[PDB]
Structures are given as structure tokens and as C-alpha cells.
DNA sequence: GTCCCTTTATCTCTCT
DNA sequence: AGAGAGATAAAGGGAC
């Protein structure tokens, strides 16, 4: 009978200050619940107005999660205490909260920084870090604890204990790595670099529990070197790939006559266990209706997702090759990277409109969605091709460069963006600005540039607008951070 | 309902 | 340009 009341309460958010749209509400109700959505429509002006100005996408953020509500009166109660005694940033104090027990990680942070960053020099950023996950203050106290028994007792960095905390359930991995760091670099011969490497993932305890466990079986056995099994439980997940692979191992093996070398390669990526599966039901299919060949299944396979890859390529094919005629050596390149099954399901859905009203080629499409994020370019390239070429005098090709690389859609925002002050301002031709944006690292490579142009370090003026863009086209803010050093 | 841990998908940037 | 590293986020599930 309080129906009413959370329907009005979930028809007034839809208004000031807030203004949220259907899939908000639902994120919200989801995640967060019931409790979670009533305590953000009593804070709406609270959580927006100063001092805390935080934005409705912030707010989102932090109401739906298991805790919302909690979250959000911790928020409320300490950003400005994090951000004045602590020098933290509001942006900071959200990506902590924005997680399933906010509240804990915050306070504990408030609690342990000084402490940490203090007496175990460590910088908030590290601390930030590590609390910016579920079960942050999990880390954060394991962190205080084990930090001198782990980095003195048993040789490590404080940055490896860093990276090993900042995941989800750092806590359990920073213990696991406490018991079977000895137990691993002397019982069965491993660099700390490669536990290291295998505790430093999500599930870090059960990637390591479970090789503990195998290495001496799997390694003496299906001929895997125990550097192969580090690769594949140093992964998403690893215990699965792990299990998964024992298993499956001779079978693909020999019932698909796949080399070990790619059953590993395979395995060896962010749920590898359900791209062992996958390959497994339909390695067969593939090569049979499809034409494909082992090699290129294996190759699908081995980015991350493989099954949503494979699935979307067995599903998508023919209709792609059929209808809108592209190659089998096109849609195995379109596959071929995390995201395959989006990058497929856009272009299907997009090779018409992008091919028309743009002029757009075929090969120019199937060259944006053969990266990673290239749905995203698809969509970023689709929306953005009238506005570009048109008002800021470029041209279809240039936009497909600029679109051709990982992080194709933040190059082309940031284009979009950084277009005019670069050009004017500055002194930039088009042709330049395209130059240093059709690499990956795009967006940073920019940002980088008209940084250093617009507050110009007074002994950088020793290069030319010229040699800078040169940089950036070379080696994008990595270079150019290499020179204001 | 809040808090913690695991696994899986996706996207972006770096370094040579 | 491709292998590696990094980061963002959702969908499980267990515990009290």
C-alpha cells in the first residue's frame, strides 16, 4: 500500500534537481533498492547544492550499489572533511564510494590515511586506490597490517602491495600472498614478479590457492611450462581457467586437434574458462557451416570474452557475409578483439546507415570495429561525421583515421573539443591535430599538447609547435612527458 | 538490506 | 600495429 508513495517518489525524481531518465531509476533500484531510491529523493537538493555540488550522474553512482543510502549520508557527512583535512578530491571521494559498502570504505579511509600515507609513505592516490573497491576497508586495514611483515619479511615493494590490494577482495590476496609466497618461489619455482602478477586480479586468492595446488600436477603433465600456467592464472579469474583447462586440456587437444600452445592461448584471457567451454561446443560448427579454420577460431578465442565473441561470429556470419557482403577475413577481424560480440552486433546494425549518409566504405567500417571499443567508434563516428566534417572544415577520411585506433571515440571527442583552440589559439593546422590524434592515445596525446601550449613550461619553449607535434605523432604523452622532464 | 569476495565483459592507453 | 597493462562496470554468489 506504499506503492503509491514509491512510484510518486520515482515520477518526482524525474524533475530538479536531479532530472533522471528510466534506466537511472531502474540502475538505482536495481543495485541500490527501495531505500536507496527514497534517501536519494530526500537529499536531491542537499547532495546538489554547495558545498558538496555533486552532479546527478555522481549521485547515480553512489545510490546504486548494496548500501546507497548509507553511502550517500557518509558522502554527504565526509567529502568535505576528506577533501579539507585530507586533500582528497570530490572525484576521489565518489570513485570511493561509488561501490557496495561505501560507508566502510570511507570511514576507514578518513580513519587509516594519515596513517598510511604517513608513517608507510604512501601517496592518497595509493589509497584511493586501494579503498576504491568493494570491501575497501578490507584492504585498507590488511594494508596497515601486512605492509612491513610483506615488504620486510618477505621482500616486497610497497607498490606490488599496493597492486595487489586495489582489487575487490585485496584483503583475501594480501593474506594468501602472507601464506604461499614461500611456498611457490622455493616449492615449486616461481619469481615472486609471477605470484605477484597472479595475486594482482580480482580472485587473487583463488588464482593462487588453485596453482599452489596444480603446478606441480599441470606442469608435469600436459607439458605446460610452469611460465604457461603463470600466464594463464596471472588472468580475470584464473582458478576457472585453471580447472577449466585441466579438464579440456586433451580433449581440444585431441578431439579438435588443437595445439596446447592455443588451448593456453586461450585460457590465458579474462574468462578463458568460458572461452575453453565455447571453443569446445563450437570449434567443430565453425569450421564445419562456416569455412573457418582452427587457427582463426583460436584467434577469436583469445581476447577477452571469447564466448560472446564466438557466439556473435557463429550467430552473425552469414548474414553479414550474405546481406551486407562482407569477407569471412573481415568478420574474423572484427572478432578478433575484447568486445567482439559489440563491435559485431554495431556494425551489423550500422554498415547501412554509415555506408549511406556518410559515403562511408565498407573496408573504412570494418577498419573503425577492428579495434577494441569499436562499437564505440562506430557510434562515435556515426554521431559526430556530419558535425565534424561540415562545421570544422575536415573530411570523411581524416575522421576514419582518427576513429582507426583504440580509444577511436575519446580521439574523436576530444577533437571535437580541442579542435579550435589548437587551430586558432595556437596555431595549428587541421592536418596536424589529425596526425596526432590517428594513434591510440588520441585523447591524452591532445590533452597533452594544448596543455603545453597554453601554459607553456618556460624551458620547453626550446622546441617548436612543430617539434611537439612531431612528438605527439610519435609517441603521444608519454613523449611529451618525457620532455617536460 | 548491507557488506564482502569472485568471475566475466568491455574499453582505453602504453611502449616500443 | 600488437602484445601488454590499466582501468570501468555488471553480474554472480555467500555471509549476517
Given at each position: 500500500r506504499?506503492?503509491?508513495?514509491?512510484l510518486?517518489?520515482?515520477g518526482?525524481?524525474?524533475?530538479?534537481?536531479?532530472?533522471?531518465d528510466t534506466?537511472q531509476?531502474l540502475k538505482?533500484?536495481k543495485?541500490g533498492?527501495?531505500?536507496?531510491?527514497?534517501?536519494?529523493?530526500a537529499?536531491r537538493?542537499?547532495?546538489?547544492?554547495a558545498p558538496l555540488?555533486?552532479?546527478?550522474?555522481?549521485?547515480?553512482?553512489?545510490?546504486?550499489?548494496?548500501?546507497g543510502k548509507q553511502?550517500?549520508?557518509?558522502?554527504?557527512?565526509?567529502?568535505?572533511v576528506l577533501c579539507?583535512?585530507?586533500?582528497?578530491?570530490?572525484?576521489?571521494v565518489?570513485?570511493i564510494?561509488?561501490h557496495d559498502?561505501?560507508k566502510?570504505a570511507?570511514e576507514?579511509?578518513?580513519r587509516?590515511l594519515?596513517?598510511?600515507?604517513?608513517?608507510?609513505?604512501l601517496?592518497?592516490e595509493?589509497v584511493?586506490?586501494i579503498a576504491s573497491?568493494?570491501g575497501?576497508?578490507?584492504?585498507?586495514?590488511?594494508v596497515?597490517?601486512?605492509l612491513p611483515?610483506?615488504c620486510?619479511?618477505?621482500?616486497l615493494?610497497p607498490?606490488q602491495?599496493?597492486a595487489?590490494?586495489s582489487?575487490?577482495?585485496g584483503?583475501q590476496?594480501?593474506?594468501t600472498?602472507?601464506?604461499?609466497?614461500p611456498?611457490?618461489?622455493?616449492?615449486?619455482?616461481?619469481?615472486?614478479?609471477?605470484v605477484?602478477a597472479?595475486?594482482?586480479?580480482?580472485?587473487?586468492?583463488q588464482?593462487?590457492?588453485?596453482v599452489?595446488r596444480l603446478?606441480?600436477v599441470?606442469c608435469?603433465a600436459?607439458?605446460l611450462?610452469?611460465?604457461?600456467?603463470?600466464?594463464?592464472?596471472?588472468?580475470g579469474?584464473?582458478?576457472?581457467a585453471?580447472?577449466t583447462?585441466?579438464?579440456?586440456?586433451p580433449?581440444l587437444?585431441?578431439?579438435?586437434?588443437?595445439?596446447?600452445?592455443?588451448?593456453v592461448?586461450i585460457?590465458?584471457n579474462?574468462?578463458?574458462?568460458?572461452?575453453?567451454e565455447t571453443?569446445?561446443?563450437?570449434?567443430?560448427v565453425?569450421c564445419?557451416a562456416?569455412?573457418?579454420?582452427?587457427?582463426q577460431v583460436?584467434?577469436?578465442?583469445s581476447?577477452?570474452g571469447?564466448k560472446?565473441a564466438?557466439?556473435?561470429?557463429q550467430?552473425?556470419?552469414?548474414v553479414?557475409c550474405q546481406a551486407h557482403?562482407?569477407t569471412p577475413?573481415q568478420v574474423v577481424?572484427?572478432?578478433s578483439?575484447?568486445?567482439?560480440?559489440?563491435?559485431?552486433e554495431?556494425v551489423?546494425?550500422?554498415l547501412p546507415?554509415?555506408?549511406?549518409?556518410?559515403?562511408?566504405?565498407?573496408?573504412?567500417?570494418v577498419?573503425?570495429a577492428s579495434?577494441?571499443?569499436?562499437?564505440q567508434?562506430?557510434?562515435t563516428?556515426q554521431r559526430?561525421?556530419?558535425?565534424?566534417?561540415?562545421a570544422?572544415?575536415?573530411?570523411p577520411?581524416?575522421?576514419v583515421?582518427?576513429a582507426?585506433?583504440?580509444?577511436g571515440?575519446?580521439?574523436?571527442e576530444?577533437?571535437?573539443?580541442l579542435?579550435?583552440?589548437?587551430?586558432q589559439a595556437?596555431?595549428?593546422?587541421?592536418?596536424?591535430?589529425?596526425a596526432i590524434?590517428?594513434?591510440?592515445?588520441?585523447?591524452?596525446?591532445?590533452?597533452?599538447?594544448v596543455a603545453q601550449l597554453?601554459?607553456?613550461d618556460?624551458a620547453?619553449?626550446?622546441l617548436?609547435n612543430?617539434?611537439?607535434?612531431?612528438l605527439?605523432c610519435?609517441?603521444?604523452?608519454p613523449?611529451l612527458?618525457?620532455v617536460?622532464?
Amino acid at each position: 500500500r506504499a506503492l503509491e508513495a514509491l512510484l510518486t517518489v520515482a515520477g518526482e525524481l524525474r524533475g530538479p534537481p536531479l532530472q533522471l531518465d528510466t534506466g537511472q531509476l531502474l540502475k538505482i533500484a536495481k543495485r541500490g533498492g527501495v531505500t536507496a531510491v527514497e534517501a536519494v529523493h530526500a537529499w536531491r537538493n542537499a547532495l546538489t547544492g554547495a558545498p558538496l555540488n555533486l552532479t546527478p550522474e555522481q549521485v547515480v553512482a553512489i545510490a546504486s550499489h548494496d548500501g546507497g543510502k548509507q553511502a550517500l549520508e557518509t558522502v554527504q557527512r565526509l567529502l568535505p572533511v576528506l577533501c579539507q583535512a585530507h586533500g582528497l578530491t570530490p572525484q576521489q571521494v565518489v570513485a570511493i564510494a561509488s561501490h557496495d559498502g561505501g560507508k566502510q570504505a570511507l570511514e576507514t579511509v578518513q580513519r587509516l590515511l594519515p596513517v598510511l600515507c604517513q608513517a608507510h609513505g604512501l601517496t592518497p592516490e595509493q589509497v584511493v586506490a586501494i579503498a576504491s573497491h568493494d570491501g575497501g576497508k578490507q584492504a585498507l586495514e590488511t594494508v596497515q597490517a601486512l605492509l612491513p611483515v610483506l615488504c620486510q619479511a618477505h621482500g616486497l615493494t610497497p607498490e606490488q602491495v599496493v597492486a595487489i590490494a586495489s582489487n575487490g577482495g585485496g584483503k583475501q590476496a594480501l593474506e594468501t600472498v602472507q601464506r604461499l609466497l614461500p611456498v611457490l618461489c622455493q616449492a615449486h619455482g616461481l619469481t615472486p614478479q609471477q605470484v605477484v602478477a597472479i595475486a594482482s586480479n580480482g580472485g587473487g586468492k583463488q588464482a593462487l590457492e588453485t596453482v599452489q595446488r596444480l603446478l606441480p600436477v599441470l606442469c608435469q603433465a600436459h607439458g605446460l611450462t610452469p611460465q604457461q600456467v603463470v600466464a594463464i592464472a596471472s588472468n580475470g579469474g584464473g582458478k576457472q581457467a585453471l580447472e577449466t583447462v585441466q579438464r579440456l586440456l586433451p580433449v581440444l587437444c585431441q578431439a579438435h586437434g588443437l595445439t596446447p600452445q592455443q588451448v593456453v592461448a586461450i585460457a590465458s584471457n579474462i574468462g578463458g574458462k568460458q572461452a575453453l567451454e565455447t571453443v569446445q561446443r563450437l570449434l567443430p560448427v565453425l569450421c564445419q557451416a562456416h569455412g573457418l579454420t582452427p587457427q582463426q577460431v583460436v584467434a577469436i578465442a583469445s581476447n577477452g570474452g571469447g564466448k560472446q565473441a564466438l557466439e556473435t561470429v557463429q550467430r552473425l556470419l552469414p548474414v553479414l557475409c550474405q546481406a551486407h557482403g562482407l569477407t569471412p577475413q573481415q568478420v574474423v577481424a572484427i572478432a578478433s578483439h575484447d568486445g567482439g560480440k559489440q563491435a559485431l552486433e554495431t556494425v551489423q546494425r550500422l554498415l547501412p546507415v554509415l555506408c549511406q549518409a556518410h559515403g562511408l566504405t565498407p573496408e573504412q567500417v570494418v577498419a573503425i570495429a577492428s579495434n577494441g571499443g569499436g562499437k564505440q567508434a562506430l557510434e562515435t563516428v556515426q554521431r559526430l561525421l556530419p558535425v565534424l566534417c561540415q562545421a570544422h572544415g575536415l573530411t570523411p577520411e581524416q575522421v576514419v583515421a582518427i576513429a582507426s585506433h583504440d580509444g577511436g571515440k575519446q580521439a574523436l571527442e576530444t577533437v571535437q573539443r580541442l579542435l579550435p583552440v589548437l587551430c586558432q589559439a595556437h596555431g595549428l593546422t587541421p592536418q596536424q591535430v589529425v596526425a596526432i590524434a590517428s594513434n591510440g592515445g588520441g585523447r591524452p596525446a591532445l590533452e597533452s599538447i594544448v596543455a603545453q601550449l597554453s601554459r607553456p613550461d618556460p624551458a620547453l619553449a626550446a622546441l617548436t609547435n612543430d617539434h611537439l607535434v612531431a612528438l605527439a605523432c610519435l609517441g603521444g604523452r608519454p613523449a611529451l612527458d618525457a620532455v617536460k622532464k
